[PDB]
Amino acid sequence: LNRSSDDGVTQLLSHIEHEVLVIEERLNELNETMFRVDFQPDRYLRLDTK
């Protein structure tokens, strides 16, 4: 019982978090794109995450 239910409850709380380490990789591409355009005469935007 312990082994099976524990493997389950871990294969979830890996999967949930592990996504966040993909969302935090897409935002690099936008921060990559938004570096090519001047928002203000010498400024550019960038996205960060807490």
Partner: protein
């Protein structure tokens, strides 16, 4: 000024010309052109602008949120049925809050004309009724997809009168550079494969209009930009097996 669009023409496909027939509050044929450097659409509120916007939308998205701009937040007051039948509804102008210009047997069509560097590519559809019955099935369907200059709604109507859907399918079989599909799923695939993009982008585009209803950046990355990977169903599922195994134990 032209340099700001110098990328245009060369790189991307472009949207230029919209054929309409018996769509929305329009009757007969109507045309518009779009200049290669953009354009604005003007007229008194209540004329056609939301109608035209929506009228292009069908070809690109599987879920048209008609009239989103003035209503972002609640369901559209309109649908494919109402437009195709030409229902003025509350906009009747005194005609019993309904007014219906095409209630009986009727035919309706649309065709947008994308292109790049002279390469025409046309996305067009045809919707028609046989009787006053207004079932979802009553509206018989057919999409088009062609890159041959010889194909237009202005032509397809002539054939649709010359014969049934069998005649149209016969034209497709005999001619070249033309395809048709009774299912929008395969047609949407026929789009995505051509344009090398997933099924996501051509949806977000259909929520560009809703910019009027922004609360903060905090939403643009919670309802529009990011896709869905939620796991409520899975998280619920594991709890079951646990209870069953506790059952065996007891």
């Amino acid at each position: 000024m032209n340099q700001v669009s110098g990328l245009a023409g060369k790189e991307s496909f472009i949207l230029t010309r919209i054929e309409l027939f018996n769509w929305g509050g329009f009757h007969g044929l109507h045309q518009a052109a779009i200049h290669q450097d953009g354009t604005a659409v003007i007229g008194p509120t209540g004329s056609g602008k939301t109608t035209l916007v929506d009228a292009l939308m069908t070809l690109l998205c599987a879920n048209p949120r008609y009239n989103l701009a003035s209503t972002g937040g609640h369901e559209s007051d309109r649908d494919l049925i109402s437009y195709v039948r030409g229902v003025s509804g509350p906009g009747d102008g005194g005609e019993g809050q309904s007014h219906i210009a095409r209630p009986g047997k009727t035919v309706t069509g649309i065709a947008a004309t994308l292109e790049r560097e002279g390469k025409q590519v046309r996305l067009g559809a045809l919707l028609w009724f046989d009787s006053t019955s207004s079932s979802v099935t009553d509206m018989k369907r057919l999409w088009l997809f062609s890159d041959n200059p010889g194909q237009t709604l202005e032509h397809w109507l002539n054939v649709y009168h010359e014969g049934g859907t069998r005649l149209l399918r016969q034209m497709e079989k005999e001619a070249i550079g033309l395809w048709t599909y009774p299912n929008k799923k395969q047609y949407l695939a026929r789009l995505r494969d051509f344009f090398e993009v997933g099924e996501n982008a051509f949806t977000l585009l259909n929520r560009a209009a809703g910019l009027k209803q922004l609360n903060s950046i905090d939403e643009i990355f919670r309802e529009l930009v990011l896709d869905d990977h939620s796991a409520f169903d899975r998280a619920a599922e594991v709890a079951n097996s646990f209870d069953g195994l506790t059952e065996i134990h007891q």
